Amino acid sequence: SGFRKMAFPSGKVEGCMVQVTCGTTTLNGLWLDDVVYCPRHVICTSEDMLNPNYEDLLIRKSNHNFLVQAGNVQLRVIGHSMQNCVLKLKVDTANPKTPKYKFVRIQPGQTFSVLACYNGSPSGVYQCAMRPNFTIKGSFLNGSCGSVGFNIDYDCVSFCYMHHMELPTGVHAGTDLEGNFYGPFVDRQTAQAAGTDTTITVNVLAWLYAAVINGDRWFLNRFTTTLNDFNLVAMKYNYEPLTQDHVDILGPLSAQTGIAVLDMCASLKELLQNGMNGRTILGSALLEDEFTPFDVVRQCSGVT
Amino acid sequence: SGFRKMAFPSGKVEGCMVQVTCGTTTLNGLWLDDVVYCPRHVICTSEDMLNPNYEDLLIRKSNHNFLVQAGNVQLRVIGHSMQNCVLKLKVDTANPKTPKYKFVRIQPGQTFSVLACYNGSPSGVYQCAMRPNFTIKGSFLNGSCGSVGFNIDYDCVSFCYMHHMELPTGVHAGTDLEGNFYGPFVDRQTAQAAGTDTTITVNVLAWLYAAVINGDRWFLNRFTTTLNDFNLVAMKYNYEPLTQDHVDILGPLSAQTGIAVLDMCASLKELLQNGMNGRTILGSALLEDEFTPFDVVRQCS
Numbered sequence: 358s359g360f361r362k363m364a365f366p367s368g369k370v371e372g373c374m375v376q377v378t379c380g381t382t383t384l385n386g387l388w389l390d391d392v393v394y395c396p397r398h399v400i401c402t403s404e405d406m407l408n409p410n411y412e413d414l415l416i417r418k419s420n421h422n423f424l425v426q427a428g429n430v431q432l433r434v435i436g437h438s439m440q441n442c443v444l445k446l447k448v449d450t451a452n453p454k455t456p457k458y459k460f461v462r463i464q465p466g467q468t469f470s471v472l473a474c475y476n477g478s479p480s481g482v483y484q485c486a487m488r489p490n491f492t493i494k495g496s497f498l499n500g501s502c503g504s505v506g507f508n509i510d511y512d513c514v515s516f517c518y519m520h521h522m523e524l525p526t527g528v529h530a531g532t533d534l535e536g537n538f539y540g541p542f543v544d545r546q547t548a549q550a551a552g553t554d555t556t557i558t559v560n561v562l563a564w565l566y567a568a569v570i571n572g573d574r575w576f577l578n579r580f581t582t583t584l585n586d587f588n589l590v591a592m593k594y595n596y597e598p599l600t601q602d603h604v605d606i607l608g609p610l611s612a613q614t615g616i617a618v619l620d621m622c623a624s625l626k627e628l629l630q631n632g633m634n635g636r637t638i639l640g641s642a643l644l645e646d647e648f649t650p651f652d653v654v655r656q657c658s659g660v661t
Numbered sequence: 662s663g664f665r666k667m668a669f670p671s672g673k674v675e676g677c678m679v680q681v682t683c684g685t686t687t688l689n690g691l692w693l694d695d696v697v698y699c700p701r702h703v704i705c706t707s708e709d710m711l712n713p714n715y716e717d718l719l720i721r722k723s724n725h726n727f728l729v730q731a732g733n734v735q736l737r738v739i740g741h742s743m744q745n746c747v748l749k750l751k752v753d754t755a756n757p758k759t760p761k762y763k764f765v766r767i768q769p770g771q772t773f774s775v776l777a778c779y780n781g782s783p784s785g786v787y788q789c790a791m792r793p794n795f796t797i798k799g800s801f802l803n804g805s806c807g808s809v810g811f812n813i814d815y816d817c818v819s820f821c822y823m824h825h826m827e828l829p830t831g832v833h834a835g836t837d838l839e840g841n842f843y844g845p846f847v848d849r850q851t852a853q854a855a856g857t858d859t860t861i862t863v864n865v866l867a868w869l870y871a872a873v874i875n876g877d878r879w880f881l882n883r884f885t886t887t888l889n890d891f892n893l894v895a896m897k898y899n900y901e902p903l904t905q906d907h908v909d910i911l912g913p914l915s916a917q918t919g920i921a922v923l924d925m926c927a928s929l930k931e932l933l934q935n936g937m938n939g940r941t942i943l944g945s946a947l948l949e950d951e952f953t954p955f956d957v958v959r960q961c962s
């Protein structure tokens with residue numbers, strides 16, 4: 358029994374983290390095969406950051422300008438190129454600890470594990486969700502850029518996030534491993550803001566199901582509803598629309614617990630309209646939306 | 662900025678997880694140098710759950726009754742001994758992935774990371790605290806016994822918890838790596854129940870300081886309190902007594918924020934009285950007690 362926000366074991370990714378220094382800037386890199394991946398903004402000074410021309414900034418650097426440290430050992434940079442907002446540093450040695458991996462781009466609402474790093478050294482791991490406004494509510498300090506996010510399925514590490522910046526509201530923005538930003542953000546010191554966020558409806562439902570599985574049932578009721586009716590409620594409370602795909606995805610949990618998805622939506626409708634009236638759900642006084650349906654299944658089953 | 666329940670990176674512990682089989686029972690073991698540590702209840706049969714005599718059960722076993730599997734490799738067991746409630750299986754191969762490690766018995770209120778595992782392979786990593794009633798609020802399914810809790814300080818893994826059992830209220834009980842249980846629990850399936858749980862007051866105060874560090878002051882007030890009047894109030898909300906040690910421990914966070922410990926205590930008293938009135942603190946609508954003062958300093962600016 359029990360339910361906890363849970364991250365994937367980080368071992369396979371720890372073995373890929375290196376330190377990358379350009380001039381006076383140190384941040385983290387990801388070492389896979391013979392390439393180290395890191396944010397392209399490592400090549401900027403503070404004045405550069407204001408309005409950088411990355412291709413011209415890069416033309417002036419030589420391979421020996423990039424100091425790459427794997428633990429206590431220097432790696433030798435033999436090439437450098439850019440793909441979108443990530444810098445690719447070809448090194449002379451393939452990482453002997455390279456796991457089986459893919460680069461994948463995730464959808465808002467999907468979760469992943471973040472391995473926060475500083476000076477190439479892993480410091481902590483935590484679970485994040487890609488918000489509907491394409492930010493993440495991470496925990497990062499100066500030096501964390503280049504930390505990565507990932508999922509694992511059957512050993513295969515799926516890398517989905519590289520950290521690039523913090524927004525004025527304290528939430529975080531980054532790219533996939535092909536250098537494409539999540540959200541309408543740019544790697545420069547210009548005025549940027551997170552848009553208004555919404556609540557990930559399908560994930561709240563999944564967490565309500567996790568709650569029922571764990572014996573927390575007080576919010577169940579006799580009523581049911583329809584998609585169109587519920588989605589009118591979701592819009593009112595700044596919840597994402599619930600689609601038919603979402604009902605299908607929740608399928609398993611629906612039959613395992615005898616609450617149909619639209620049965621649960623009537624519980625959530627009531628929770629949105631009336632509050633929790635002093636009670637909690639899985640120990641929370643808020644409705645939690647950073648557990649996917651798969652997250653709930655994996656934890657409420659044994660997957661390793 | 663930001664503030665998250667953060668676990669330690671798990672790789673150093675992943676390289677130590679193995680599967681231990683005895684009879685029909687499979688659970689997890691911790692492989693350090695040439696010793697595999699696991700719960701001694703792995704040797705119980707269905708008859709032995711209520712009143713096992715572990716000495717009598719163990720003297721009947723030989724080394725080859727214990728199967729130990731590391732990844733796909735069988736390890737050869739070449740000795741066995743029982744220390745309190747853990748079995749220590751001597752194996753013929755030292756673990757080449759053994760980190761710098763130590764065994765530390767922790768106090769209530771201390772936090773640590775749990776590497777949940779099933780059949781010797783890690784499933785997920787999360788953060789727990791030792792509750793005042795010596796249970797932890799974990800996430801453990803059948804087959805997770807032998808999963809371990811740990812902190813990592815620099816490059817040294819301090820192992821502090823081994824999972825043994827789930828109590829009827831859904832909370833969890835285990836041992837230190839010397840096999841001594843936390844709390845009054847025993848590895849028997851007789852009715853036992855944890856004491857009434859309480860909130861870890863020094864940890865909530867630390868988390869309130871985290872919120873100030875990250876730029877939030879809405880909950881402070883113009884008052885202060887004596888330490889004894891604070892405790893008289895906080896017991897009425899089932900909060901643990903705050904001691905002068907706790908006040909000392911919070912010194913550094915007080916210096917960083919400029920808020921004296923007993924003034925932060927006055928803010929806590931008002932929050933217990935008022936609730937949050939529709940606001941949140943570091944994203945939570947309840948007061949959070951599983952971050953220690955040490956955790957806050959290590960995560961925050």
Ligand SMILES: OCc1cc(F)cc2c1OCOC2
Nearest residue numbers: 702705710825826848849850
């Ligand atoms: O994991 C629970 C468990 C299994 C078992 F085979 C024997 C005992 C157990 O709990 C403590 O009491 C002895």
Ligand SMILES: [Cl-]
Nearest residue numbers: 766767768771
């Ligand atoms: Cl301690």
Ligand code: NA
Nearest residue numbers: 578580620623
């Ligand atoms: Na219903």
